[PDB]
Amino acid sequence: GSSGSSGNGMDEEQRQKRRRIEVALIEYRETLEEQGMKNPEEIERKVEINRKRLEVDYGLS
């Protein structure tokens, strides 16, 4: 039972992009940890760059 659907205009398309970034972020983080990344700066660095890239790629930022 959906409630308070957020999608009246262009946002309807943004709500979706938000997911593409989520799944991507998680998958990336894990892949990094297993890739041999055992440091915060490293992960944070890569992840950060990714989040920003994707966000800007989906015209979100």
Side-chain angles (χ1 to χ4, degrees):
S2 294
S3 293
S5 64
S6 321
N8 273 333
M10 302 295 156
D11 282 294
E12 74 203 355
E13 191 89 64
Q14 309 301 61
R15 73 208 278 198
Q16 307 188 17
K17 290 153 171 269
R18 291 297 313 283
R19 294 286 159 197
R20 300 189 81 169
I21 306 171
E22 285 285 342
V23 179
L25 270 178
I26 303 130
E27 286 289 303
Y28 197 45
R29 211 182 185 198
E30 292 281 90
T31 303
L32 287 180
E33 281 181 29
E34 283 268 322
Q35 262 183 0
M37 307 250 299
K38 307 202 84 272
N39 236 45
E41 310 198 80
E42 230 171 335
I43 303 181
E44 288 277 286
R45 174 151 189 78
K46 294 189 176 306
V47 178
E48 184 175 83
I49 301 160
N50 222 28
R51 185 190 304 166
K52 293 183 64 170
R53 213 169 64 195
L54 283 161
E55 271 196 305
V56 182
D57 211 62
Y58 300 117
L60 299 171
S61 204

